[PDB]
Design a protein around this ligand. Sequence first.
Ligand SMILES: *[C@@H]1O[C@H](CO)[C@@H](O[C@@H]2O[C@H](CO)[C@@H](O[C@@H]3O[C@H](CO[C@H]4O[C@H](CO[C@H]5O[C@H](CO)[C@@H](O)[C@H](O)[C@@H]5O)[C@@H](O)[C@H](O[C@H]5O[C@H](CO)[C@@H](O)[C@H](O)[C@@H]5O)[C@@H]4O)[C@@H](O)[C@H](O[C@H]4O[C@H](CO)[C@@H](O)[C@H](O)[C@@H]4O[C@H]4O[C@H](CO)[C@@H](O)[C@H](O)[C@@H]4O[C@H]4O[C@H](CO)[C@@H](O)[C@H](O)[C@@H]4O)[C@@H]3O)[C@H](O)[C@H]2NC(C)=O)[C@H](O)[C@H]1NC(C)=O
Ligand SMILES: *[C@@H]1O[C@H](CO)[C@@H](O[C@@H]2O[C@H](CO)[C@@H](O[C@@H]3O[C@H](CO[C@H]4O[C@H](CO[C@H]5O[C@H](CO)[C@@H](O)[C@H](O)[C@@H]5O)[C@@H](O)[C@H](O[C@H]5O[C@H](CO)[C@@H](O)[C@H](O)[C@@H]5O)[C@@H]4O)[C@@H](O)[C@H](O[C@H]4O[C@H](CO)[C@@H](O)[C@H](O)[C@@H]4O[C@H]4O[C@H](CO)[C@@H](O)[C@H](O)[C@@H]4O[C@H]4O[C@H](CO)[C@@H](O)[C@H](O)[C@@H]4O)[C@@H]3O)[C@H](O)[C@H]2NC(C)=O)[C@H](O)[C@H]1NC(C)=O
Ligand SMILES: *[C@@H]1O[C@H](CO)[C@@H](O[C@@H]2O[C@H](CO)[C@@H](O[C@@H]3O[C@H](CO[C@H]4O[C@H](CO[C@H]5O[C@H](CO)[C@@H](O)[C@H](O)[C@@H]5O)[C@@H](O)[C@H](O[C@H]5O[C@H](CO)[C@@H](O)[C@H](O)[C@@H]5O)[C@@H]4O)[C@@H](O)[C@H](O[C@H]4O[C@H](CO)[C@@H](O)[C@H](O)[C@@H]4O[C@H]4O[C@H](CO)[C@@H](O)[C@H](O)[C@@H]4O[C@H]4O[C@H](CO)[C@@H](O)[C@H](O)[C@@H]4O)[C@@H]3O)[C@H](O)[C@H]2NC(C)=O)[C@H](O)[C@H]1NC(C)=O
Ligand SMILES: *[C@@H]1O[C@H](CO)[C@@H](O[C@@H]2O[C@H](CO)[C@@H](O[C@@H]3O[C@H](CO[C@H]4O[C@H](CO[C@H]5O[C@H](CO)[C@@H](O)[C@H](O)[C@@H]5O)[C@@H](O)[C@H](O[C@H]5O[C@H](CO)[C@@H](O)[C@H](O)[C@@H]5O)[C@@H]4O)[C@@H](O)[C@H](O[C@H]4O[C@H](CO)[C@@H](O)[C@H](O)[C@@H]4O[C@H]4O[C@H](CO)[C@@H](O)[C@H](O)[C@@H]4O[C@H]4O[C@H](CO)[C@@H](O)[C@H](O)[C@@H]4O)[C@@H]3O)[C@H](O)[C@H]2NC(C)=O)[C@H](O)[C@H]1NC(C)=O
Ligand code: ZMR
Ligand code: ZMR
Ligand code: ZMR
Ligand code: CA
Ligand code: CA
Ligand code: CA
Ligand code: CA
Lengths: 388, 388, 388, 388
Amino acid sequence: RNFNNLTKGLCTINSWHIYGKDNAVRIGESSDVLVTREPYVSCDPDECRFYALSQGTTIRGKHSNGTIHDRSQYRALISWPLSSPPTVYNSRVECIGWSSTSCHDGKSRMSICISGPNNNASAVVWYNRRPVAEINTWARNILRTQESECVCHNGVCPVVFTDGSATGPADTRIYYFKEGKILKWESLTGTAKHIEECSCYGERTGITCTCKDNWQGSNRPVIQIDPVAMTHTSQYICSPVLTDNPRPNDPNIGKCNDPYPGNNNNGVKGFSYLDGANTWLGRTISTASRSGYEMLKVPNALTDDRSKPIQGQTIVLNADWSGYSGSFMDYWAEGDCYRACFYVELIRGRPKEDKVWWTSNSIVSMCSSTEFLGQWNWPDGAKIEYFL
Amino acid sequence: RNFNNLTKGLCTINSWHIYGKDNAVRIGESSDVLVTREPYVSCDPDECRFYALSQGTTIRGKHSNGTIHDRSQYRALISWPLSSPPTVYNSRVECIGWSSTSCHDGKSRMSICISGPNNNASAVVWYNRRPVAEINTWARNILRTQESECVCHNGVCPVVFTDGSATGPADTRIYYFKEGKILKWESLTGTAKHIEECSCYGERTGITCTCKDNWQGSNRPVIQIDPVAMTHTSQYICSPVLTDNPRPNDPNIGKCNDPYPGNNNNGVKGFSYLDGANTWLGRTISTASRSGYEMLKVPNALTDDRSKPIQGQTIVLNADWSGYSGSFMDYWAEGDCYRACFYVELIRGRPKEDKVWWTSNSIVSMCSSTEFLGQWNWPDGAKIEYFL
Amino acid sequence: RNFNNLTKGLCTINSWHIYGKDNAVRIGESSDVLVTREPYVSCDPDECRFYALSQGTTIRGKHSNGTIHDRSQYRALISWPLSSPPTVYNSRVECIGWSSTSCHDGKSRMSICISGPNNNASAVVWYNRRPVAEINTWARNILRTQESECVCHNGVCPVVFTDGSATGPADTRIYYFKEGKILKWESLTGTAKHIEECSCYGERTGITCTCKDNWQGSNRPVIQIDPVAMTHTSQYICSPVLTDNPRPNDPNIGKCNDPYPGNNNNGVKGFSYLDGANTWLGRTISTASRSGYEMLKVPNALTDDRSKPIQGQTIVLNADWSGYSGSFMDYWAEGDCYRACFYVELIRGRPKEDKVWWTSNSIVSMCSSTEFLGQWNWPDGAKIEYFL
Amino acid sequence: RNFNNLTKGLCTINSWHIYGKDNAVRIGESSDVLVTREPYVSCDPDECRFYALSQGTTIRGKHSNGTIHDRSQYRALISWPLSSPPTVYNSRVECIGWSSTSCHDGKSRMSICISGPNNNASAVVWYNRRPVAEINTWARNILRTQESECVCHNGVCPVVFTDGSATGPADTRIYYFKEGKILKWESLTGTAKHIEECSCYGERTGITCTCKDNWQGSNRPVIQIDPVAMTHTSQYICSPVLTDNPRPNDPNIGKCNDPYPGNNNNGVKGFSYLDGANTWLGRTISTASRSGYEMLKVPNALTDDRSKPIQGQTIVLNADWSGYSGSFMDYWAEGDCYRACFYVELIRGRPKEDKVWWTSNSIVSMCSSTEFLGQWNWPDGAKIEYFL
Ligand SMILES: *[C@@H]1O[C@H](CO)[C@@H](O[C@@H]2O[C@H](CO)[C@@H](O[C@@H]3O[C@H](CO[C@H]4O[C@H](CO[C@H]5O[C@H](CO)[C@@H](O)[C@H](O)[C@@H]5O)[C@@H](O)[C@H](O[C@H]5O[C@H](CO)[C@@H](O)[C@H](O)[C@@H]5O)[C@@H]4O)[C@@H](O)[C@H](O[C@H]4O[C@H](CO)[C@@H](O)[C@H](O)[C@@H]4O[C@H]4O[C@H](CO)[C@@H](O)[C@H](O)[C@@H]4O[C@H]4O[C@H](CO)[C@@H](O)[C@H](O)[C@@H]4O)[C@@H]3O)[C@H](O)[C@H]2NC(C)=O)[C@H](O)[C@H]1NC(C)=O
Ligand SMILES: *[C@@H]1O[C@H](CO)[C@@H](O[C@@H]2O[C@H](CO)[C@@H](O[C@@H]3O[C@H](CO[C@H]4O[C@H](CO[C@H]5O[C@H](CO)[C@@H](O)[C@H](O)[C@@H]5O)[C@@H](O)[C@H](O[C@H]5O[C@H](CO)[C@@H](O)[C@H](O)[C@@H]5O)[C@@H]4O)[C@@H](O)[C@H](O[C@H]4O[C@H](CO)[C@@H](O)[C@H](O)[C@@H]4O[C@H]4O[C@H](CO)[C@@H](O)[C@H](O)[C@@H]4O[C@H]4O[C@H](CO)[C@@H](O)[C@H](O)[C@@H]4O)[C@@H]3O)[C@H](O)[C@H]2NC(C)=O)[C@H](O)[C@H]1NC(C)=O
Ligand SMILES: *[C@@H]1O[C@H](CO)[C@@H](O[C@@H]2O[C@H](CO)[C@@H](O[C@@H]3O[C@H](CO[C@H]4O[C@H](CO[C@H]5O[C@H](CO)[C@@H](O)[C@H](O)[C@@H]5O)[C@@H](O)[C@H](O[C@H]5O[C@H](CO)[C@@H](O)[C@H](O)[C@@H]5O)[C@@H]4O)[C@@H](O)[C@H](O[C@H]4O[C@H](CO)[C@@H](O)[C@H](O)[C@@H]4O[C@H]4O[C@H](CO)[C@@H](O)[C@H](O)[C@@H]4O[C@H]4O[C@H](CO)[C@@H](O)[C@H](O)[C@@H]4O)[C@@H]3O)[C@H](O)[C@H]2NC(C)=O)[C@H](O)[C@H]1NC(C)=O
Ligand SMILES: *[C@@H]1O[C@H](CO)[C@@H](O[C@@H]2O[C@H](CO)[C@@H](O[C@@H]3O[C@H](CO[C@H]4O[C@H](CO[C@H]5O[C@H](CO)[C@@H](O)[C@H](O)[C@@H]5O)[C@@H](O)[C@H](O[C@H]5O[C@H](CO)[C@@H](O)[C@H](O)[C@@H]5O)[C@@H]4O)[C@@H](O)[C@H](O[C@H]4O[C@H](CO)[C@@H](O)[C@H](O)[C@@H]4O[C@H]4O[C@H](CO)[C@@H](O)[C@H](O)[C@@H]4O[C@H]4O[C@H](CO)[C@@H](O)[C@H](O)[C@@H]4O)[C@@H]3O)[C@H](O)[C@H]2NC(C)=O)[C@H](O)[C@H]1NC(C)=O
Ligand SMILES: CC(=O)N[C@H]1[C@H]([C@H](O)[C@H](O)CO)OC(C(=O)O)=C[C@@H]1NC(=N)N
Ligand SMILES: CC(=O)N[C@H]1[C@H]([C@H](O)[C@H](O)CO)OC(C(=O)O)=C[C@@H]1NC(=N)N
Ligand SMILES: CC(=O)N[C@H]1[C@H]([C@H](O)[C@H](O)CO)OC(C(=O)O)=C[C@@H]1NC(=N)N
Ligand SMILES: [Ca+2]
Ligand SMILES: [Ca+2]
Ligand SMILES: [Ca+2]
Ligand SMILES: [Ca+2]
């Protein structure tokens, strides 16, 4: 086997087709399905799999009570076959913790899990299913990472971490791993003022990450990483099509180098594909809550502070709950281009649906098509009343 | 690995032997068995598997309520080991949607799933477990396909699709795929007046598909495909032994080039093996409903408008519910001929058994023998009262 | 891979050690464990597995009601990993039917299942997981076979079948298969007067089968098969240590060429290892019912009509229910001799325990040791009251 | 494949990072999780797995009643994927019995299980999943072994056994196996006065086992084995940091060649890594009961009868139940040193929590880091009240 190199550009995105859906909450009403949150998708050279942070209990289990909680000792990164639900009997534990990332370099997979109390957390870096390196908290305030896949080029896999405040300046670092070992790390540079939960993808231009500014911004910060030089830049998506949640209404001028104001101390993990005229942004439909999901074609969104949509696709109706979203691609597929993909976490239960005492989710996932395909909408599909 | 070529003729069919049976509804009374419908069987070079459209819930799950419904966002094509039931923990998701086909070309498997609303559905073509090509609705009226396996020759795998009315003229296309890519498509030609849910098999003569005319015909339309020239013809089975359901009683003269009249706007997926004196037709025993199943040896049924049975075998008693049926063969078996096989979907629940709120099925499957074997009958075997 | 040849003798049997136990009924009180009966064990070159006839329902399932029944359409030969229980999710279906045998020839496995009504049953012979040959009933009276593993030599795998009365002269045939194809069959010859449910093993001397005379005999008939010449002989175990059940008390003179009288029209499947001074016989402890199990070292039991035990080992206490027993060996193990093994079916439920409405079993299995090991006893271990 | 050789030293231990955790009791509240106890971890060259003695019932099953019991016929050594729980459907049975050890030699795995009544127990030695050798009880008083992994060097795998009194002098033997065959055994020599449940690890210096003195000692006996010469020595950990449970308070002078007095006829399985200045000892926090767990860096603990801690790490709070602990390492990992690892059994249920009628456990496991990582604590996490 050889390390994968990012040699292709993105395929032209003319619409999005259904890729995967697990219906986990529906099935888990009467099956041993693990409670999860913070899911994602990631491919090996021979298989693509769903990933998430388990809560170490099934949904029907009495221990599902209290699973709105983010960081217990009972959480772990698990993976399971594409579009199956995460069950006790089919889920493979990648590592133990409450914040994660994972990616295949073409030879083996690296998985990283962070665990610990708020003031003493640590990352353990796994490679080829063995622990290889460890990183202690540097700011003693909830060391945390992407919650979606990382990306590798010639064996080098950059990962974005943040340690420090969620409501003020924090200490973000970009680490560069190879075979699980730390080659290098660097402090965040550029104009992004706060970074969490980066969603990344790679193509010949390098690695592009769309993150969340939890502190002041409702536009999304972007980190662009050169995995050969092992350097990066940062800014915000310039477009006035704002993509965090909650967020203000879309203005006519966005902000390239500072947070667009209106909403503070909150946000949701999200993503974009930034590719000139082939640029597509994901966002919740609601400006107030994690409901609905849509894709919008916004030419040169990264650099054009006046850019507006010229095409779109609804993925989840505003009437239905969404959640985290992130990017991944099958780097090992046939063809001359990388097909952009994404997932949307469909959160069920607390805090929005409090008649149950649990919080979980299911997954829907799409990839791009060069056809202009008809659109459907893709709800979680479970009926909360059944769980009462 | 090499692409499979259709180099053999059918084995002589002198009776049918039991091949597989999953007892899914019996087992699912107390196990995490997924609700399904529209099942089939399909072989890889090293394994044969059961396939069906899941409803994204188990039978005992409260979400089984309402599963008479055909086209939700919670459906997916799944496969699972031969004669096991389709469980949450053993079912592999092939693609997402509510109409499907799948076949192995000798190197890898192609699976196709259609999803979307009635006026905006699309097919996604998967090859070697990756999405490769997409096809948008062309008539904006429930794009739909075979619901049983396709067949390949030297890498070319033809598939029959229909888009348009179920009760009048529609737009049927035959697509020719290789490695998931579209080589060619053509509009239906010939004398078949309406085409749905083709059941196909291949042999040195080419690929033969027996379909359903939902509009006016109670004889079955046939499409004969040359996978090298990538062309086809169509007509009806000439025999007065009528094989759709519901249907009129058998006359003494059938119809080769037009629907045999009596029953409109309904039908059931079915199959036949058309092979001169070695011809066998499948049909429900009842002329009114999906109950019973029998095989009848009807020499030259395809071409002889006076042909009658000279031998038969009961598969399911008229007292027991049947459903969809279709053809498949193990193209990778040893020997000098292809052994004809088929499955019968045994539907339980709604609309016929409405004391439960779900609709599901189990599978029974037979293959041909050159012996004249004794016959049994093969009911689903579940007791509805247990589910109350 | 090469066909296995029977080149070794039996290891010296000085005691029996625990080999496997699945505790199926205990576990099935609260797990999706299939109802079974007629179990056995059989090895591949890389794995040994448990086998049994499923009843197509779990024990806790309402369809377990009535499973005392022997021959429904819902039965199948299944296999599952050594010492695990037969669950819905881990059981592999080998073929469909209500009487079976199976064996690996060193290259692939042959499995045979019989299905059908009493007057029209048929065997389907599977090889490398595909149906290859079929055999119709020849006496129209419950065609039936070994219910434990067959044995192969240089690709030839003999199997004993019986068709006809259980209470009078019947038509027994020995079939010789290779790669699933019928090389030859012959009618039973020799002095055995009735043959059912042969338990076989192989060693350089040939293949030895210990069967059951259901009609008149409480001594066991023996069939000795030469798999090269494809011929056989038959007689009874000469020893007055009688090993059927029910049976009379042990006399001082046995019978070599006729049934030992006292009990008619009943019996249980059993086994022996007939090897001169290294001869060991299995039997129930009770003479009246299927309870208890013991091994007895009876020198030259096959040929000596005065032979008595000189050593023994209790396997299951008389206070505990037993059932069918049979022979198997790991033909692919290291060493200079074949280690004799056996299983005992531990039947729970009806008819002996009628407070439940089901009949099932678990498995215990032992192999021989050249040590003189201490003995334990091995009950099923389930408490019937828990199922009420 | 080649036999593994112990060619590396221990990595420098500066802290411990989370390695695995299965949350078995939490998950088993509503899933088919087997009741276990006496767990451990052991690696193959391509995978690391959890191991334990099943009780042949699930936790929610009614047969969980009475599982405080140590030695029934329903116990077996099982293994399952790292950090998954031991379920009916994912657990692989290694052998049958109520005391075990297991280890991979680089080519295949040896597993040993002891079964039988107290006065007639026997060990069966399995190699590459086949029984190879058997050992009868030599003292007729509960033949018993390590309850954690053994260690191999160039194909030779030493194992420590004890037969005889738990409250007085007993007969301990060290066996040396290769490919499951007995090369040699020897009686215990040295100054250890009672030996049970050795926890072993290997490094270039040889194989080091830390055991339990059940009779008089609250310091732990140590056996040091040369797997080439096949000889051993024994003594106690000299340190006054006492590590058995229950135990007296730590004095200022320990004992090298005799039991440190204060607590008789009890103890718990435990471990240490004895490596000069890189020495770390594990122990329960409580001196009275199996609660809490901590690691303490105690330079030259083995040889220095005045040695005290200079660093530590809490693993389980004193408020939480612990249990058995033992050593293992991934001998097949990359790098220039072997990374020390350990597991802690977290016992739930009886005798400490008697509102339930069962006894089971979950597992937490850590490995060493050369970083000085922040510490968390790792409770079982189940709420007993949920099981009522
Ligand atoms: C079968 O399936 C197919 C395929 O899915 C379906 O076809 C799809 O239909 C959907 C729904 O209509 C389309 O999505 C929308 O796309 C429009 C963009 O396209 C329009 O505008 C284009 C740009 O026009 C401008 O520039 C051009 C030059 O570049 C200039 O020519 C023009 O004059 C103008 O200046 C047009 O080019 C385009 O026309 C083309 O396409 C037409 C088909 O759509 C075709 O008929 C034409 O002939 C031509 O070919 C077209 O006019 C997006 O604007 C829109 O997204 C907005 O609206 C949705 C609600 O629907 C909202 O959720 C979005 O967030 C967004 O609106 C918010 O943001 C805006 C930007 O800031 C803001 O201005 C809005 O006020 C609004 O803001 C408010 O809400 C948000 C969200 O809550 C909040 O954050 C804000 O604060 C604020 O409160 C949709 O994405 C697909 O493109 C279309 N696909 C295709 C291939 O056709 C088909 O319908 C299905 N068939 C059936 C029968 O069902
Ligand atoms: C152990 O197992 C074995 C193996 O399974 C069992 O043996 C099997 O037994 C079954 C049941 O009897 C047989 O199935 C039937 O086969 C007949 C066809 O065979 C008969 O007819 C042949 C043709 O005769 C004609 O042509 C020849 C020349 O070609 C000429 O010589 C003759 O005079 C006549 O002109 C005969 O050749 C054949 O004889 C041969 O075989 C005999 C054994 O069967 C043997 O004894 C002879 O010596 C000779 O060797 C034989 O006479 C099918 O016709 C029949 O199917 C019809 O009937 C069933 C109900 O039973 C029905 O469900 C079918 O749909 C069908 O009838 C409907 O359709 C007809 C065609 O349109 C129509 O005419 C009918 O009126 C009827 O239509 C009505 O119902 C349908 C359905 O609801 C509806 O749609 C219509 O609208 C309308 O309402 C069976 O398939 C097996 O062939 C046979 N197998 C073997 C190898 O023997 C054995 O019984 C078991 N043993 C025990 C103890 O149980
Ligand atoms: C730890 O574990 C170890 C290992 O398991 C335990 O040791 C084992 O202990 C068991 C139980 O005692 C033994 O099983 C029994 O073996 C005897 C056979 O051995 C005895 O007889 C031998 C033959 O003697 C005759 O011939 C020799 C010459 O060949 C001659 O010298 C002698 O005078 C006589 O003529 C002796 O050689 C042998 O002695 C040797 O071994 C001794 C140890 O056992 C040792 O101490 C001596 O020094 C010497 O080395 C010994 O005396 C079997 O006969 C017996 O089986 C019968 O009894 C059981 C009930 O216990 C019954 O279930 C069996 O079916 C059978 O009896 C039925 O069938 C008979 C034959 O027809 C019939 O005659 C009986 O009347 C009876 O029939 C009735 O019941 C049946 C069944 O329901 C029914 O069908 C009939 O119709 C009728 O109603 C046992 O198998 C093991 O051999 C022994 N193993 C070893 C290695 O030692 C140890 O006990 C454990 N330790 C502890 C502390 O628990
Ligand atoms: C984020 O995470 C990090 C990493 O985990 C956290 O940092 C960790 O903090 C923990 C908790 O404090 C530390 O564990 C303790 O370690 C001490 C040992 O270190 C101390 O002592 C060292 C030795 O000093 C002696 O020798 C040196 C020369 O060698 C000499 O200089 C000195 O004067 C003295 O003579 C010191 O070197 C060391 O200082 C160094 O480290 C400091 C940081 O810790 C640093 O600040 C200094 O600058 C310097 O660098 C330090 O002083 C262990 O002694 C202790 O274990 C005892 O106490 C715990 C309870 O806390 C108890 O459970 C243990 O069993 C043990 O005490 C029992 O046994 C003793 C031995 O017999 C006995 O004497 C005690 O009385 C007691 O016995 C009683 O209880 C037991 C148990 O029930 C019973 O059996 C007996 O019978 C009896 O009843 C802890 O292990 C970590 O080392 C530390 N790690 C690191 C890398 O810093 C950090 O806190 C977290 N941050 C936050 C914000 O939460
Ligand atoms: C695409 C679709 O919904 N196909 C239907 C099909 C269809 O309604 C009729 O053929 C008429 O066109 O009939 C029914 C049926 O059992 O009659 C099953 C199919 N259900 C599914 N494939 N999901
Ligand atoms: C084919 C068949 O039904 N075989 C029977 C067998 C049979 O009734 C007797 O041997 C008499 O002929 O006995 C019973 C039995 O436990 O006595 C089990 C077998 N059940 C099954 N194999 N399913
Ligand atoms: C063979 C056996 O029963 N070993 C016991 C062990 C033993 O009783 C003591 O060490 C005294 O000798 O203690 C207990 C224990 O938790 O204290 C667990 C072990 N249970 C099992 N291994 N099943
Ligand atoms: Ca924000
Ligand atoms: Ca019709
Ligand atoms: Ca008899
Ligand atoms: Ca002690």
